[PDB]
A paper describes a structure:
Type VII secretion systems (T7SSs), also referred to as ESAT-6 secretion ([name]) systems, are AAA+-dependent molecular machines that are found in the Actinomycetota phylum and have gained great attention due to their implications in cell homeo­stasis and host–pathogen interactions in mycobacteria. Among them, [name]-5 is found almost exclusively in slow-growing pathogenic mycobacteria, where it participates in nutrient uptake, intracellular colonization and modulation of the immune response during infection through the secretion of a large family of protein effectors: the PE and PPE proteins. [name] is a pivotal component of the pore complex, providing the secretion driving force via the hydrolysis of ATP. In the [name]-2 to [name]-5 systems, [name] consists of two N-terminal transmembrane (TM) helices connected to two additional helices (the stalk region) and a domain of unknown function (EccCDUF), which are followed by three FtsK/SpoIIIE AAA+ [name] domains, here referred to as D1, D2 and D3.
Here, the crystal structure of the MtbEccC5 [name] domain is reported at 2.05 Å resolution, which reveals a nucleotide-free structure with degenerated cis-acting and trans-acting elements involved in ATP binding and hydrolysis. The core structure consists of a six-stranded parallel β-sheet (β5–β1–β4–β3–β2–β2′) further extended by an additional two-stranded antiparallel sheet (β6–β7). The C-terminal α-helical lid present in other prokaryotic AAA+ domains is missing in the structure, which is flanked by two parallel helices (αA and αB) and a two-stranded antiparallel sheet (βA–βB) that connects to the stalk domain. This structure is conserved in both molecules present in the asymmetric unit (r.m.s.d. of 0.173 Å for 218 Cα atoms). The proposed ATP-binding site should be located at the N-terminus of the α1 helix and the C-terminus of the β3 strand, which are expected to contain the P-loop and the Walker B motif, respectively. Sequence analysis of the Walker A motif shows a highly degenerated and one amino acid shorter sequence (GEREQVL231) that is missing the conserved G2 and G3 glycines as well as the Lys and Thr/Ser residues that are key for ATP/Mg2+ stabilization (Val30 and Leu231 in). Inspection of the crystal model shows an ATP-free structure in which the degenerated Walker A motif folds as an extended α1 helix instead of the standard P-loop conformation. Altogether, this points to variations of G2 and G3 as structural factors responsible for the extended α1 helix observed in . Inspection of the Walker B motif also shows conformational deviations in , which include a shorter β3–α3 loop and a hydrophobic residue (Val329) replacing the catalytic base.
Author numbering: 124 to 166, 166A, 166B, 166C, 199 to 274, 284 to 310, 316 to 417
The structure:
């Protein structure tokens, strides 16, 4: 019963700090049996005047079915959703299964990720696409095009593209990069031209997207419909989760 036990797999992201160190942390497995591997909660099903009468179920995206997602909206709500996605993944998946990278011309917003092992380089926070491409050359060398979803190859890489830079094209083509999912925050045309990858916000925090099948993640309509009332994690909530995970790692 996935809807009955949804709080064990996809809870509200501000509950994750208190749950750090529980047996649900880093429990996801790329074994072909865990259908939540590579899945991340983005929000809830209730919205507007219907919030009080709709049984709220989590809404999610799979990292394995698209080479990227493009978050289109106002700066703060786009950052809030990205922080919720990062916190969800850092809690549910171990850094041996999911690694993370941020490429941003706004470093002040990403200082909190210094506590997460997922961003540790064997810190994967870069200020330009050129610096990122030099540091991550070994990641991209020999990698083919993205193949949408047996055992999943690991680590999967989640990259936050937060810099409007024409050099993005020379790193991520239309075919995508195998084992990587980008999340664009800029709203530039190269990311937003594919409709099945767009998450369009409205001022209330509701996102619309092409609906997908609940079991296969396959797109089921070519027009955008309600997708989720997004989860929003503030800098303080994200830093609280990140520091709590860091203290668990030191203990």
């Amino acid at each position: 019963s996935m809807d009955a036990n949804y709080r064990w797999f996809h809870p509200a992201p501000n509950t994750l700090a208190a749950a750090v160190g529980s047996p649900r942390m880093w429990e996801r497995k790329p074994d072909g049996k865990d259908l939540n591997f590579g899945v991340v909660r983005v929000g809830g099903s209730g919205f507007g005047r219907y919030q009080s009468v709709v049984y709220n179920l989590p809404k999610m995206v799979s990292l394995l079915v698209e080479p990227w997602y493009a978050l289109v909206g106002e700066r703060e709500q786009v950052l809030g959703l990205m922080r919720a996605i990062i916190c969800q993944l850092a809690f549910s998946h171990g850094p041996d299964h999911v690694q993370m990278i941020v490429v941003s011309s706004d470093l002040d917003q990403w200082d909190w990720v210094k506590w997460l092992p997922h961003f540790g380089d064997s810190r994967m926070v870069y200020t330009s696409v050129r610096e990122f491409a030099a540091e991550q050359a070994e990641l991209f060398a020999g990698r083919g095009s993205f193949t949408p979803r047996a055992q999943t190859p690991t680590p999967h890489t989640v990259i936050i593209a937060d810099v409007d830079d024409p050099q993005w094209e020379y790193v991520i083509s239309a075919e995508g990069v195998d084992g990587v999912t980008f999340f664009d925050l800029t709203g530039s045309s190269m990311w937003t031209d594919i409709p099945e990858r767009k998450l369009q916000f409205d001022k209330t925090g509701v996102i619309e997207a092409l609906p997908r099948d609940r079991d296969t993640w396959m797109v089921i309509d070519d027009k955008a419909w309600f997708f989720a009332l997004t989860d929003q994690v503030s800098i303080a909530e994200a830093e609280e989760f990140a520091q709590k995970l860091a203290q668990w790692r030191l203990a």
